[PDB]
Write a protein that binds this DNA or RNA. Structure first.
Lengths: 247, 692, 732
RNA sequence: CACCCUGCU
RNA sequence: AGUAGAAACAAGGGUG
């Protein structure tokens, strides 16, 4: 287990020793984001300024052993320049495009299940229903309405505990499940998420998005079905209605 | 003893027991009999945790070592003295592994003998009162609670267990020893404020009170006893909000300033540019730019040695001559490199300003200098109105003989709403394609992209860049247009508003004497001549500058095209909603609907829909082209009066408070920009033509 | 036929064409250098607006004090600062009478969240002013530095791990006399005494407003020390709790809520039967709002609101305005002289600006300097009354809505009853009466009781008009609301975040504008095409058939040359855009999956690529786009190789603070190691008291022993792990 | 001087 | 000179 050896390596130094020995767990939060830089309070300007330079984006180190320093033509694809405030590597956009034809291939057919919420939408839209167009004044009322096409109707924290139990099972504390429906869901879910190489926080986030209920003050005209609230673009507009029902 | 815990027990016990202890108001000596009991609990637990270790052969054997030498593991799984989150970490890791239930209150141990889990507890309560209170605490599950006691008492699940006794004998000895040998001391949020800051608070009181306590005691007993009535009776009668009316006649004009005239400030020419044309199948971003400039320049006959026609009052104008004199030279250089720097000829040095920057010398060493003073800090000099802007607007609205905006198509459509919107945008783009404002935005985006790109690439190199544009024709073939040349300067730009200094050379056919005021900075430098009739062809040459923000905004200029359609199609929405039919066709074609869009001696003259569309392009274009910190002040202070006039025009009884002040505000913005001045004149003329 | 587009308003109403008055397709102005003149201008303006107040001092510090309390009442139409105590007391006693239980409900709820909250939350927020480094530092940095300098000297409570005790310790700070400060000179040490300490902790710095449109001259904005954002968060929760539930409030507000709220407030009065009573609305803006509000008023207001609560709560909440009263504001930067027409240029000390005559600089600024002189004590001015923009946002609106409430038919004692809406910067005052003299008298009493409370209508901007068409907060209403696609043109464009994080925000903004603010379908197609083109240009991703030459030409040429159906190729890999309105709600990868090539997908979706950087969950598929203040926008798109993170600014290097960068490297390495043990630390800031390696070594022992019981691993690893634990423990 | 760290610190 | 504006751009600290 190379990790503990890495820990010793970091421990033998004086500075890291003094830091770790005197960093209580709570302080960790602070230390996660101590920074001398600020936020880009003109996102478009600096982006226009970056896309003309040579080494604008940042990547990890596994590049060198995974992507060549030279190109097939000779265009630099990464540089020895270490980044400020970090230990990453400067990279030009050109690398990405190569990776898109000479790159490591893996299996992503168990991919669409992580992102259930999204693919649901397209498989719906494929099976839509056509109907005529009508022009007339349209009564509008600004009221609160929900937008998720079905969920567990469970609380925010009620799903937070669920997710912490399923994905990071060794770390869910003394809290226990109570409901049978949610029990069955967590069961089938612990079943589904096995043998899938995928980002941890990403999958947990997709599930958090697929569970909790969300409402918004929106100007509705007529029915408040969430599958309908999805397609307010082509259902009704400023002075017209179009006939179509969600799949 | 007060420190009986640090006195005789083991240090490890002391620390691991105190860490779990100090968690509430409990201090190091509170009711000094209980700490002993807590630490003794920890001692007996720990000492039970010794003298038992697992063999790979899974037996139970007493191991004198009390510490395994190698290749072994101890028979316990301590959970006391641990951390909160680690506690549950451990226990749940135990759960999902081979065998463990879910325990609900903090247990102590675990054993891989047959996959079971022990709980322990020893205090004064003798046998079952403690055993049964513990039962009440944890009964809801099956668990292996092997409890001990002082003398000899131990019980197991149905008294069913497997473990040796010499260990429990050791436990007996422990409880034997810890009778304190008969106990020879016989037994058994507030947030106040300090001094200094309370003083600082005292100093913060209304002028009669002297202590924050009395202020509390006074606000406590409050009930309305007449404050607003009495005060508004005693408050003198000058302070009031008098009402003033707004009658039919629309009031007096906003007096423009007085001074010398206004000149063209555009970073490029507007209606004085030519276009050298080459037939070339090049696409929008195709071709070598320098090479197209070559093929353009080559097809013109009549160049002659330049001579200055219109000097530049403040400047060494001879330099500009040499500037142009250099260009053709370099042009013959590439009979091609996709980029060409330019030698540091001094004619290109003064005209772009090197070393014209006072050295940031230290102040304390230069306090004896006679002219030690802060700079500028004063107001822009005033100006007047000149009559070219209206000709520029009139020409801008006109329809050219060339398309200028090819668009990248989108995904096919099935929904009928999509078919309708597509058939609308077809007509809109057909009308808004051929317009000189489209030429404007195309040229502007191409020039400012080239500028920001090259200024980001090279930071000490005098690049030069031609200005070629692409536009097809009704016939079908596509031409290539050359307009002039640009030469850049050094580009160390730290702040967002730093300046780059660049020289511009544009073709023209306008003899400048007919209107010298608008060329106060340009330097007409007659280059060659044309034949048709013979008309002299001039090259307006000048030194101007730009910044990072202006460049960025110049990058996105087609967004003006969004402020147009949204106002044209909202004219079709409110009018298609009535007739109950697809109305937009009869509103763009055969259209009779008109709209007052100007003023002439005959009166207000109307226009069809496309006139409105192009007219609406024009204002959006000029709001960016001549953007200025006076335009915004004018628009923001004049929308008020515009709304008030509108409210009057339809019987809403409008009344005001102070019109003179609003007029002062509308006038304080008019200083020098041709733009804000034309808009002020416009609004005044409209108020005159719209009494009611 | 010389054209004039303003002639358009002879057929189209000036509220159905308002969109064509915004010059918002240009660039906003900025600030070219220092902003200290603005600082003394505003400070002098306050000290003159409260002149016949009392001149006073401090016994602890020395910064001169000024009381704008009632004193002489006003005598003409001139902004003044003599709001009334009895007025502000009764003004909300009445409000309580109007709706019982508001104040006590707020006390309960804020009490609960106050005892529940933690210090770590502070970590989010805008920039702040650090009192140890004398400079504008980001939030977490100043947090860490203040905690550290706290631990350095003799404090013992902050280890509680909570927040309320952190604020306590801030409180205790001001009693010592010999505070020790660390400096990062390339780490010397300095000492600050009690006086200069109290002076140092109360200083909110000044800066220049930027990029804000709708004004001619520039303004000044102040930022408060991180020492007091804690108290700010308590008083903010209190006030927001009071004002979440007022029909005539809009501070704890949202968007369309405003429109529906004023729509139903128009209904009733507009509904007023057309029998015997005519009505107007006054559109009114308040001039110089924060230059007449005061700390004493807020403090007495608090002494009234939280009557009958635990003294813990009342003290905690009342400390903020006291700390707010005795505040000092930094002068600014200085002045960059020419000092001659020859090549001389310099920069003067913002302190020597108080030590020099500055006769050299224009005599108007000489007046500024001469008047501001007596208010400077140490590099800063004493702003006892007034407050600079951007500090509170709520209590002022509570005062405004209270004096609104004063105008019912209940206590005005006459026919006139005024009411309306108050939204931080605007008041729409609808007055109802049968008589013209009624409207006159109503407006007079309103303005009168307002000047009694220090809120003075701007007569230069406020106007009366019959109800039916009026506007406020740049929402314009003509027998109902209409749409102006003008204030949302700034947001249209390449957001400037990433590639995939932008190809979604663009379509999302088009979505919201097509759903709420009347952007028809033709314009939808339009903005979609414009966004496509601008994106393709700013990211060099033109179509595969294009022979446009860029730095990324040849690669994308490769990618295109070998693909059976390129319709699967992504947008920023050279793929045809297929968005429409039907397709406008699904991120792109989900839309074109069906049409991709397999190996492509394997190379584009694979989590083994190094160009993806995931941070704490508080920032995922989010973005803070440029707009009012900045709000957090969310989007959705399949995470792929395009979600890079552009670089940072390498400018601390050529300075005397580069060592902070190395400290950051060390911290980050220490932190990633922890993260290797508990991935759940992405969904929970884990609480604990340890030395941060106990967690590591403990879980190490545990997990090893676990895996060896079922899984396949040899025991030499068991033994070696156990002796490496001995290793990590043998030192300290 | 000759060289090179910066382009929101 | 030019930009611009109630202040500043027209490259700054570092080594011999």
């Amino acid at each position: 287990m190379e990790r503990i050896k890495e820990l010793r390596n970091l421990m033998s130094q004086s500075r890291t020793r003094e830091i770790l020995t005197k960093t209580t767990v709570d302080h960790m939060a602070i230390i996660k984001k101590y920074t001398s830089g600020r936020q880009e309070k003109n996102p478009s300007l600096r982006m226009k300024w970056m896309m003309a330079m040579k080494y604008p984006i940042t990547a990890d180190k596994r590049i060198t052993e995974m992507v060549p320093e030279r190109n097939e033509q000779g265009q630099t694809l990464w540089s020895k320049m270490s980044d400020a405030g970090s230990d990453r590597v400067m990279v030009s956009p050109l690398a990405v495009t190569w990776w898109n034809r000479n790159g490591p291939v893996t299996s992503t057919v168990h991919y669409p299940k992580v992102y259930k919420t999204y693919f649901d939408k397209v498989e719906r839209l494929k099976h839509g229903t056509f109907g005529p167009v009508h022009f007339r004044n349209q009564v509008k009322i600004r009221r609160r309405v929900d937008i998720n096409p079905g969920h567990a109707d469970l609380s925010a924290k009620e799903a937070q505990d669920v997710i912490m139990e399923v994905v990071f099972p060794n770390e869910v504390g003394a809290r226990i499940l109570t409901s049978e429906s949610q029990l069955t869901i967590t069961k089938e879910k612990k079943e589904e998420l096995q043998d899938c190489k995928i980002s941890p926080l990403m999958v947990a986030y997709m599930l958090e998005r697929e569970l909790v209920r969300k409402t918004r003050f929106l100007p509705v005209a007529g029915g408040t079905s969430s599958v309908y609230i999805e397609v307010l673009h082509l259902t009704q507009g400023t002075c017209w209605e179009q006939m179509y029902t969600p799949g | 003893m007060e420190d009986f815990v640090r006195q005789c027990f083991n240090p490890m016990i002391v620390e691991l027991a105190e860490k779990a202890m100090k968690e509430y108001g409990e201090d190091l000596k509170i009711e000094t009999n209980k700490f002993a009991a807590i630490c003794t609990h920890l001692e007996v637990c720990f000492m039970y945790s010794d003298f038992h270790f697992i063999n790979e052969q899974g037996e139970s054997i007493v191991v004198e070592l009390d510490d395994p030498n190698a290749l072994l593991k101890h028979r316990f799984e301590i959970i006391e003295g641990r951390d909160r989150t680690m506690a549950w970490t451990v226990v749940n890791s135990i759960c999902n592994t081979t065998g463990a239930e879910k325990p609900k209150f903090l247990p102590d141990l675990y054993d891989y003998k047959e996959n079971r889990f022990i709980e322990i507890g020893v205090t004064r309560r003798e046998v079952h009162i403690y055993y049964l209170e513990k039962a009440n605490k944890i009964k809801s599950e099956n668990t292996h609670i092997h409890i001990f006691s002082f003398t000899g008492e131990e019980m197991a699940t149905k008294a069913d267990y497997t473990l040796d006794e010499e260990s429990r004998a050791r436990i007996k000895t422990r409880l034997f020893t810890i009778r304190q040998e008969m106990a020879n001391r016989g037994l058994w949020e507030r947030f106040e404020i300090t001094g200094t800051m309370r003083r600082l608070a005292d100093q913060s009181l209304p002028p009669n009170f002297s202590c924050l306590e009395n202020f509390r005691a006074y606000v406590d007993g409050f009930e309305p006893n007449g404050c607003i009535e009495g005060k508004l009776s005693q408050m003198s009668k000058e302070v009031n909000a008098k009402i003033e009316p707004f009658l039919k006649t629309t009031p007096r004009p906003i007096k423009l300033p007085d001074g010398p005239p206004c000149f063209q400030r555009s970073k490029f020419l507007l209606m004085d540019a030519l276009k050298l044309s080459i037939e070339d199948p090049s696409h929008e971003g195709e071709g070598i730019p320098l090479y197209d400039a070559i093929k353009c320049m080559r097809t013109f006959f009549g160049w002659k040695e330049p001579y200055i026609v219109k000097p530049h009052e403040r400047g060494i104008n001879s330099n500009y001559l040499l500037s142009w004199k250099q260009v053709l030279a370099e042009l013959q250089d590439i009979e091609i490199p996709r980029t060409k720097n330019m030698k540091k000829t001094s004619q290109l040095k003064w005209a772009l300003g090197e070393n014209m920057a006072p050295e940031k010398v230290d102040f304390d060493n230069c306090r004896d200098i006679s002219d030690l003073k802060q700079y500028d800090s004063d107001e822009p000099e005033l100006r007047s109105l000149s009559s070219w802007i209206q000709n520029e607007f009139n020409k801008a609205c006109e329809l050219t003989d060339s398309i200028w905006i090819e668009l990248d198509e989108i995904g096919e459509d099935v929904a009928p709403i999509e078919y309708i919107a597509s058939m609308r945008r077809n007509y809109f783009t057909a009308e808004v394609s051929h317009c000189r404002a489209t030429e404007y935005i195309m040229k502007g985006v191409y020039i400012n992209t080239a500028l920001l790109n090259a200024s980001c690439a090279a930071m000490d190199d005098f690049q030069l860049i031609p200005m070629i544009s692409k536009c097809r024709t009704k016939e079908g073939r596509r031409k290539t247009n050359l307009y002039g040349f640009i030469i850049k300067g050094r580009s160390h730009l730290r702040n967002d508003t730093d300046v780059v200094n660049f020289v511009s050379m544009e073709f023209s056919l306008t003899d400048p004497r007919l209107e010298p005021h608008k060329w106060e900075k340009y330097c007409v430098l007659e280059i060659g001549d044309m034949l048709l009739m013979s008309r002299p062809m001039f090259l307006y040459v000048r030194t101007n500058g730009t910044s990072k923000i202006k460049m960025k905004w110049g990058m996105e200029m087609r967004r003006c095209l969004l402020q147009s359609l949204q106002q044209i199609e909202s004219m079709i929405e409110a009018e298609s909603s009535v007739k109950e039919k697809d109305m937009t066709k009869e509103f763009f074609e055969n259209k009779s609907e008109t709209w007052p869009i100007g003023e002439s001696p005959k009166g207000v003259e109307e226009g069809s829909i496309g006139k409105v569309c192009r007219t609406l392009l024009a204002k959006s274009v000029f709001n960016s082209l001549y953007a200025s910190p006076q335009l915004e002040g004018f628009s923001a202070e004049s929308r008020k009066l515009l709304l008030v006039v509108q409210a009057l025009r339809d019987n809403l009884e409008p009344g005001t408070f102070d019109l003179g002040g609003l007029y002062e505000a509308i006038e304080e913005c008019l200083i020098n920009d041709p733009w804000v001045l034309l808009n002020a004149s416009w609004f005044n003329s409209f108020l005159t033509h719209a009494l009611r | 036929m010389d054209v004039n587009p303003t002639l358009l308003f002879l057929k189209v109403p000036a509220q159905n064409a308002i969109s064509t008055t915004f010059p918002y397709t240009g660039d906003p102005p900025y600030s070219h250098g220092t902003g200290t003149g603005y600082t003394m201008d505003t400070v002098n303006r306050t000290h003159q607006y409260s002149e016949k107040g009392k001149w006073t001092t401090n016994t602890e510090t020395g910064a001169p004090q000024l009381n704008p309390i009632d004193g002489p009442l006003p005598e003409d139409n001139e902004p003044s600062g003599y709001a009334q105590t009895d007025c502000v007391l009764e003004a909300m006693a009445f409000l309580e009478e109007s709706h019982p239980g508001i104040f006590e409900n707020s006390c309960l709820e804020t009490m609960e969240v106050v005892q529940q909250t933690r210090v770590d939350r502070l970590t989010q927020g805008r920039q702040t002013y650090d009192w140890t480094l004398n400079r504008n530092q980001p939030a977490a940095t100043a947090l860490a530095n203040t905690i550290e300098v706290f631990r350095s000297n003799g404090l013992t409570a902050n280890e509680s791990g909570r927040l309320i005790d952190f604020l306590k310790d801030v409180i205790e700070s001001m009693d010592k006399e010999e505070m020790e400060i660390t400096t990062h000179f390339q780490k010397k040490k300095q000492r600050v005494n009690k006086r200069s300490y109290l002076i140092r902790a109360l200083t909110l710095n000044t800066m220049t407003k930027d990029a804000e449109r709708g004004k001619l001259k520039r303004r000044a904005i102040a930022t408060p020390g991180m020492q007091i954002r804690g108290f700010v968060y308590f008083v903010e929760t209190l006030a927001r709790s009071i004002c979440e539930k007022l029909e005539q409030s809009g501070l704890p507000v949202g968007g369309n809520e405003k429109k529906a709220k004023l729509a139903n407030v128009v209904r009733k009065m507009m509904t007023n039967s057309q029998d015997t009573e005519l009505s107007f609305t006054i559109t009114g803006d308040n001039t110089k709002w924060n230059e007449n509000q005061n700390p004493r008023m807020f403090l007495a207001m608090i002494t009234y609101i939280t009557k009958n609560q635990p003294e813990w709560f009342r003290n905690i909440l009342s400390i903020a305005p006291i700390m707010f009263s005795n505040k000092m504001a930094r002068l600014g930067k200085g002045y960059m002289f020419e000092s001659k027409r020859m090549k001389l240029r310099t920069q003067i000390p913002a302190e020597m600006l108080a030590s020099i005559d500055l006769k050299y600089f224009n005599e108007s600024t000489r007046k500024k300097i001469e008047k501001i002189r007596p208010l400077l004590i140490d590099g800063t001015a004493s702003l006892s009354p007034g407050m600079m923009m951007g500090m509170f946002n709520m209590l002022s609106t509570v005062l405004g809505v209270s004096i609104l409430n004063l105008g019912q038919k209940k206590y005005t004692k006459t026919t006139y009853w005024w009411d309306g809406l108050q939204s931080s910067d605007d008041f729409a005052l609808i007055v109802n009466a049968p008589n013209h003299e009624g409207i006159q008298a109503g407006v007079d009493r309103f303005y009168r009781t307002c000047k009694l409370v220090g809120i003075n209508m701007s007569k230069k901007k406020s106007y009366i008009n019959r109800t039916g068409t009026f506007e406020f907060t740049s929402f314009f209403y003509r027998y109902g609301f209409v749409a102006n696609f003008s204030m949302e043109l700034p947001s249209f464009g390449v957001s400037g975040i990433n590639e995939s994080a932008d190809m979604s925000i663009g379509v999302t903004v088009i979505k919201n504008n097509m759903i709420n603010n009347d952007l028809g379908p033709a314009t939808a197609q339009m903005a979609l095409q414009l966004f496509i083109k601008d994106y393709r240009y700013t990211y060099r991703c033109h179509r595969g058939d294009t022979q446009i030459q860029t730095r990324r030409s040849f690669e994308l040429k490769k990618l295109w040359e070998q693909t059976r159906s390129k319709a699967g190729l992504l947008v920023s890999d050279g793929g045809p855009n297929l968005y429409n309105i039907r397709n406008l709600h699904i991120p792109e990868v989900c839309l074109k999956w069906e049409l991709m090539d397999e190996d492509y997908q394997g190379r584009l979706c694979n989590p083994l690529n190094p160009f993806v950087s995931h941070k704490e969950i508080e920032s995922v598929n989010n973005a803070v786009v440029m707009p009012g203040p900045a709000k957090s926008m969310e989007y959705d798109a399949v995470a792929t190789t395009h979600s890079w993170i552009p670089k940072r600014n390498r400018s601390i290097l050529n300075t005397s603070q580069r060592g902070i960068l190395e400290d950051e490297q060390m911290y980050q390495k220490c932190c990633n190691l922890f993260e290797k043990f508990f991935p759940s630390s992405s969904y929970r800031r884990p609480v604990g008291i340890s030395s941060m390696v106990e967690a590591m070594v403990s879980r190490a022992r545990i997990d090893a022993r676990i895996d060896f019981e079922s899984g396949r691993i040899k025991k030499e690893e068991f033994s070696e792990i156990m002796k490496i634990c001995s290793t990590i423990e043998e030192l300290r």
